[PDB]
Amino acid sequence: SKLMDKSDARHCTVIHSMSQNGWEDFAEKYDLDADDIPSFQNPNDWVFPWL
Amino acid sequence: KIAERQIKRRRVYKSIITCTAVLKDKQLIAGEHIPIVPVFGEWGFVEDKEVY
Amino acid sequence: NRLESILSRFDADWTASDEARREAKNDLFFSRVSQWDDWLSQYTTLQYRGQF
Numbered sequence: 352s353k354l355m356d357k358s359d360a361r362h363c364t365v366i367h368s369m370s371q372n373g374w375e376d377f378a379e380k381y382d383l384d385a386d387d388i389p390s391f392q393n394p395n396d397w398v399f400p401w402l
Numbered sequence: 403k404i405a406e407r408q409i410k411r412r413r414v415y416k417s418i419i420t421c422t423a424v425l426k427d428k429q430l431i432a433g434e435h436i437p438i439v440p441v442f443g444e445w446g447f448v449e450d451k452e453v454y
Numbered sequence: 455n456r457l458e459s460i461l462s463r464f465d466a467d468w469t470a471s472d473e474a475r476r477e478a479k480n481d482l483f484f485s486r487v488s489q490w491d492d493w494l495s496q497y498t499t500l501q502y503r504g505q506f
Contacts (some may be wrong), residue, residue: 370470372463395495448486449479 366394 354359369377376387409423414431431437445454470472490503 370466372466402469446486448482453486 366391368394 352358357363367377374388375385377383411433414433414436415428416426416431417428423426442454445452447453480491489505490496492503
């Protein structure tokens with residue numbers, strides 16, 4: 352894509368990070384199997400020592 | 403007397419007390435609230451403890 | 455049961471927001487009680503600690 356509004360882009364990927372209860376909520380909303388825990392490329396790092 | 407009804411209201415009682423006995427117990431006060439009116443400055447709560 | 459689910463959700467939220475709540479509680483203590491957040495060395499030795 353060579354436009355600021357990204358209108359030339361023919362695809363886009365949005366990464367969703369959600370807590371466990373958020374995972375069951377998402378699975379119920381989209382009719383997914385909550386047992387199979389998903390995984391993807393991790394958008395955020397652990398540079399800060401979060402608990 | 404048409405009928406009777408139950409109405410919820412607040413009553414203020416004053417009791418003059420000492421460290422050893424109560425001289426006056428539950429004297430009904432006219433007002434519906436505690437008559438003392440507090441005036442505060444930089445009021446607030448920090449750790450569930452009043453700080454003004 | 456209900457108790458386990460409620461406690462799990464509360465623990466998840468508490469662990470997620472622990473750092474934010476600690477920082478905000480420090481802000482409240484600093485701006486309301488005192489600016490010397492010294493809990494250990496406050497008793498080791500008596501030295502002048504101004505509040506300007």
